Amino acid sequence: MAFPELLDRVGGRGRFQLLQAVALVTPILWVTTQSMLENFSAAVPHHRCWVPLLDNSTSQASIPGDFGRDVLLAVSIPPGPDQRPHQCLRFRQPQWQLIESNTTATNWSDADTEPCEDGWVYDHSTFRSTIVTTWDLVCDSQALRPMAQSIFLAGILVGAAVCGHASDRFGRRRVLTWSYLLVSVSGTIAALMPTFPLYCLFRFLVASAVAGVMMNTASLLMEWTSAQAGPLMMTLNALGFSFGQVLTGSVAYGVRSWRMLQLAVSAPFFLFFVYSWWLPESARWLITVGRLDQSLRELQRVAAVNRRKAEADTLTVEVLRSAMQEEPNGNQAGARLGTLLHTPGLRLRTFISMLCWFAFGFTFFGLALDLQALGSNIFLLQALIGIVDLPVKMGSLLLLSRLGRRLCQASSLVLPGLCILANILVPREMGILRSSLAVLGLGSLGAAFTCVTIFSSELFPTVIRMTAVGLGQVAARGGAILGPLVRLLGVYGSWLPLLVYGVVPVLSGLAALLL
Numbered sequence: 117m118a119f120p121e122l123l124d125r126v127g128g129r130g131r132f133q134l135l136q137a138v139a140l141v142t143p144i145l146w147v148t149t150q151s152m153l154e155n156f157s158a159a160v161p162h163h164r165c166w167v168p169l170l171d172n173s174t175s176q177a178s179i180p181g182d183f184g185r186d187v188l189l190a191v192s193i194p195p196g197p198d199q200r201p202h203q204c205l206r207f208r209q210p211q212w213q214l215i216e217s218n219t220t221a222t223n224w225s226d227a228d229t230e231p232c233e234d235g236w237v238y239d240h241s242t243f244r245s246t247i248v249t250t251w252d253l254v255c256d257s258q259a260l261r262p263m264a265q266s267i268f269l270a271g272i273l274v275g276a277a278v279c280g281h282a283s284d285r286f287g288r289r290r291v292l293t294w295s296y297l298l299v300s301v302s303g304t305i306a307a308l309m310p311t312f313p314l315y316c317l318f319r320f321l322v323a324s325a326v327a328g329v330m331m332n333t334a335s336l337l338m339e340w341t342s343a344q345a346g347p348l349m350m351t352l353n354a355l356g357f358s359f360g361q362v363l364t365g366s367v368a369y370g371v372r373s374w375r376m377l378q379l380a381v382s383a384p385f386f387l388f389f390v391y392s393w394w395l396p397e398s399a400r401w402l403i404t405v406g407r408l409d410q411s412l413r414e415l416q417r418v419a420a421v422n423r424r425k426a427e428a429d430t431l432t433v434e435v436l437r438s439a440m441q442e443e444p445n446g447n448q449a450g451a452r453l454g455t456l457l458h459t460p461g462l463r464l465r466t467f468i469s470m471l472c473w474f475a476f477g478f479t480f481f482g483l484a485l486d487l488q489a490l491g492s493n494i495f496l497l498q499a500l501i502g503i504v505d506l507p508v509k510m511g512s513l514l515l516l517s518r519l520g521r522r523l524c525q526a527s528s529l530v531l532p533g534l535c536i537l538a539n540i541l542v543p544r545e546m547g548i549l550r551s552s553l554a555v556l557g558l559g560s561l562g563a564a565f566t567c568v569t570i571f572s573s574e575l576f577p578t579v580i581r582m583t584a585v586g587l588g589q590v591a592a593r594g595g596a597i598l599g600p601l602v603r604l605l606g607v608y609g610s611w612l613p614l615l616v617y618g619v620v621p622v623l624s625g626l627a628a629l630l631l
């Protein structure tokens with residue numbers, strides 16, 4: 117009397133699973149908002165150096181002559197690479213000579229310019245305040261944003277590991293609801309810190325709790341349903357991320373202050389926590405540990421929801437004990453890691469699998485967090501990524517049976533990569549075509565994640581099937597951390613970050629055909 121018999125006899129498809137799927141997919145949207153808020157809360161607006169002549173009204177009253185704002189801006193600030201006033205320099209001694217056109221204003225030495233020691237001036241047309249405006253992440257401090265994003269992703273990884281151990285030892289629902297509470301508390305606290313390091317630490321905690329809640333939601337959604345309806349729930353979970361993208365765009369358009377935006381994003385998790393208590397605990401894990409009475413109570417409850425009390429009556433403790441006896445043992449999990457790499461037949465498939473996992477995190481998170489440089493309307497670009505993803509994710513499922521198994525991975529990585537590499541070659545004059553290629557590039561990478569999850573299981577044997585999938589997750593998380601740090605290469609040239617973000621997926625796709 118295995119557990120699947122009990123799950124089928126109490127009802128696997130009836131009602132209850134739909135309600136549980138809704139209640140566990142709703143928080144995924146806000147999980148996505150928390151993950152991708154860093155694009156909007158930390159946007160860098162156009163800035164110019166602070167000038168006593170222009171900004172200070174006391175010096176404004178002392179100006180001899182009614183000089184226009186553009187004239188004074190040209191007098192005070194050297195021109196920049198894009199014919200705009202330069203961001204990080206200022207004339208120490210106001211140059212009245214530059215106004216006259218009889219002198220070619222080209223012989224300016226760096227010794228005549230000094231760093232902006234009196235602050236900066238930011239435009240507030242599109243954003244009222246970001247962390248860059250608040251803590252002056254400009255010039256010499258421009259490299260700290262990728263550090264913050266990498267800290268967030270490392271927090272995701274550490275939280276995933278810690279919550280894995282905690283859910284293995286204590287259960288699913290308890291860790292899930294405590295993750296809800298910790299998300300809410302940590303976000304609310306982070307929305308009020310005065311200094312940058314405290315903000316980074318509390319974002320680290322938020323990321324840890326987000327990883328925990330995502331993993332526990334996935335596990336609970338998978339475990340309470342029969343194997344026949346698993347892919348439908350996985351597809352719903354995948355669509356949850358696109359809906360979260362759309363929600364992130366809408367909410368970021370709604371609120372233009374980073375503190376208020378963070379508070380609004382972190383608020384609904386308390387409402388999730390308050391009702392998370394009513395959710396039934398997973399019966400299989402309760403059977404595994406040995407709390408037969410609690411598992412029987414949950415089984416009776418869930419069968420009562422399915423309006424199947426007549427079949428629910430005959431459940432007995434001895435059947436539960438037999439099911440516990442029939443549970444497979446996890447002792448061999450220690451040696452499953454070694455046999456993946458030591459076996460030559462298994463070694464080559466793992467390396468190809470890891471590269472596919474690695475390419476997704478490295479490419480997507482290095483670009484999905486940098487929509488500022490890919491276009492002007494960040495609000496429209498954020499929503500379009502979610503919108504384009506849905507047709508591609510569903511369309512890729514149909515493509516599986518027709519063109520075969522092997523060709524799927526290569527096509528799902530080469531095409532998104534080539535679009536990114538085509539971004540450089542397109543002239544900057546055509547902005548409409550320039551932005552469209554980037555949208556299709558990152559938008560199509562969503563089908564890559566969905567494909568690899570299904571693909572990895574079927575290759576490996578059932579004995580080590582679970583372990584191999586876990587290794588791919590670690591590589592994807594590890595590749596995410598290295599993503600934002602690539603943007604530091606932009607000082608050499610603007611095309612350098614895009615070349616790495618395009619070349620890497622292509623090689624991963626081209627090496628994927630050898631499986």
Ligand SMILES: CCc1oc2ccccc2c1C(=O)c1cc(Br)c(O)c(Br)c1
Nearest residue numbers: 148151272354357562565566592593596
């Ligand atoms: C925003 C969700 C998320 O944040 C992470 C941080 C570190 C490693 C993985 C993730 C991760 C995913 O797994 C993921 C999976 C699928 Br399928 C998607 O279509 C999108 Br979009 C994201």
